[PDB]
Design an enzyme around this catalytic site. Sequence first.
Site, PDB file in Angstrom:
ATOM      1  N   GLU A  20      35.861  26.205  20.900  1.00 11.84           N
ATOM      2  CA  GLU A  20      36.657  25.916  19.717  1.00 11.84           C
ATOM      3  C   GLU A  20      37.574  27.096  19.477  1.00 11.84           C
ATOM      4  O   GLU A  20      37.205  28.243  19.760  1.00 11.84           O
ATOM      5  CB  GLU A  20      35.749  25.678  18.503  1.00 11.84           C
ATOM      6  CG  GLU A  20      36.451  25.316  17.218  1.00 11.84           C
ATOM      7  CD  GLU A  20      37.162  23.988  17.330  1.00 11.84           C
ATOM      8  OE1 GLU A  20      38.361  23.938  17.621  1.00 11.84           O
ATOM      9  OE2 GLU A  20      36.477  22.969  17.190  1.00 11.84           O
ATOM     10  N   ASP A  57      32.017  22.737  21.059  1.00  8.28           N
ATOM     11  CA  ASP A  57      32.357  23.995  20.410  1.00  8.28           C
ATOM     12  C   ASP A  57      31.956  25.264  21.137  1.00  8.28           C
ATOM     13  O   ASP A  57      32.693  26.254  21.102  1.00  8.28           O
ATOM     14  CB  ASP A  57      31.733  23.999  19.023  1.00  8.28           C
ATOM     15  CG  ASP A  57      32.411  23.017  18.104  1.00  8.28           C
ATOM     16  OD1 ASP A  57      33.651  23.016  18.151  1.00  8.28           O
ATOM     17  OD2 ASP A  57      31.723  22.259  17.376  1.00  8.28           O
ATOM     18  N   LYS A  78      28.541  12.459  14.434  1.00  4.29           N
ATOM     19  CA  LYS A  78      28.802  13.285  15.610  1.00  4.29           C
ATOM     20  C   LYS A  78      28.187  12.681  16.858  1.00  4.29           C
ATOM     21  O   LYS A  78      28.819  12.629  17.916  1.00  4.29           O
ATOM     22  CB  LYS A  78      28.251  14.698  15.422  1.00  4.29           C
ATOM     23  CG  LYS A  78      29.074  15.584  14.526  1.00  4.29           C
ATOM     24  CD  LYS A  78      30.449  15.855  15.112  1.00  4.29           C
ATOM     25  CE  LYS A  78      31.096  17.022  14.400  1.00  4.29           C
ATOM     26  NZ  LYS A  78      32.519  17.174  14.735  1.00  4.29           N
TER      27      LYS A  78
END
Length: 200
Positions: A85, A113, A139
Amino acid sequence: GPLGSMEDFVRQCFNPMIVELAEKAMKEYGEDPKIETNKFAAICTHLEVCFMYSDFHFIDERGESIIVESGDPNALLKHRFEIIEGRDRIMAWTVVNSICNTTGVEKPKFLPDLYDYKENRFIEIGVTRREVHIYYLEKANKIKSEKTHIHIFSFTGEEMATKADYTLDEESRARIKTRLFTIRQEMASRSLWDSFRQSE
Ligand SMILES: N#Cc1cccc(-c2c[nH]c(=O)c(O)c2)c1
Ligand SMILES: [Mn+2]
Ligand SMILES: [Mn+2]
Ligand SMILES: [Mn+2]
């Protein structure tokens, strides 16, 4: 109290590097930080959490996981986490494909991430103003086939993680929760919280 601007809050309460990365991300997402201001704050918060999750964690000269909270980690220590990320699209996928072809870990279909070199898995970090279990499901449903480990934090200290496996020690996760509480409390003092919470 007086109503502050979310812009002011973001610039005053996040590190400038985080803010800049968040601005760059929104430009890439096609969103203007000066209009989608709750989103801007959420992106900054999530980026910071990703950084904090990775902070201090190393794999030692012997290959075990250790925490080094000093300014000088020994030069033989390797970072435990790769951070995905915050990178632009091209670089983020470049880093993912590298990890993947290198570790045999299959390629995810969405950018995660982090990559955890100890647990040998990608991580999706979630930060939510809603109950963790609902956000968790959202998610996971986007992720579908799951190699990728999910770790959700809420602003009120709840967490939910894949298979009840929380990856990190309590102290590390406590640092993150303390930071989230500080963000919420400061937003609240500027009368920005209720809307920020409701806007998710
Ligand atoms: N646009 C937008 C937007 C707003 C809030 C949060 C995020 C976000 C980004 N990356 C992530 O990995 C994530 O979990 C959330 C994106
Ligand atoms: Mn992103
Ligand atoms: Mn991400
Ligand atoms: Mn995330």
